[PDB]
Design a protein around this nucleic acid. Sequence first.
RNA 1: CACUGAC
RNA 2: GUCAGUG
Length: 112
Amino acid sequence: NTASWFTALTQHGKEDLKFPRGQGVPINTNSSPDDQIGYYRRADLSPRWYFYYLGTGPEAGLPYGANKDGIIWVATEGALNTPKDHIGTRNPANNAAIVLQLPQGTTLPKGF
RNA sequence: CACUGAC
RNA sequence: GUCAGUG
């Protein structure tokens, strides 16, 4: 289980990935409202950003909001500040990446 | 440098 | 070998 559940957001401009509070959590129809919280992490030459649920992936040890370079925090209103052990990360041998989809009305920064 | 996946 | 993810 070595990979994001989702395809990358690709940075085509000089602006880093960032989202307004409440936005940025990729849609997962097998997930519940408690689960809608995690971080994007930086991996053509275009930098790629990958989403990982809180308490999972490279920065599984980071609590929400903890500042680190190349790490962006997102949460949908009503999400619980708990590790998403039951979702975890993706085995690429067993599972294809979910196409990263954000809902109507989501602000994407320039170059995404 | 190493491990894994796809081709 | 190539591309990609991770350490």
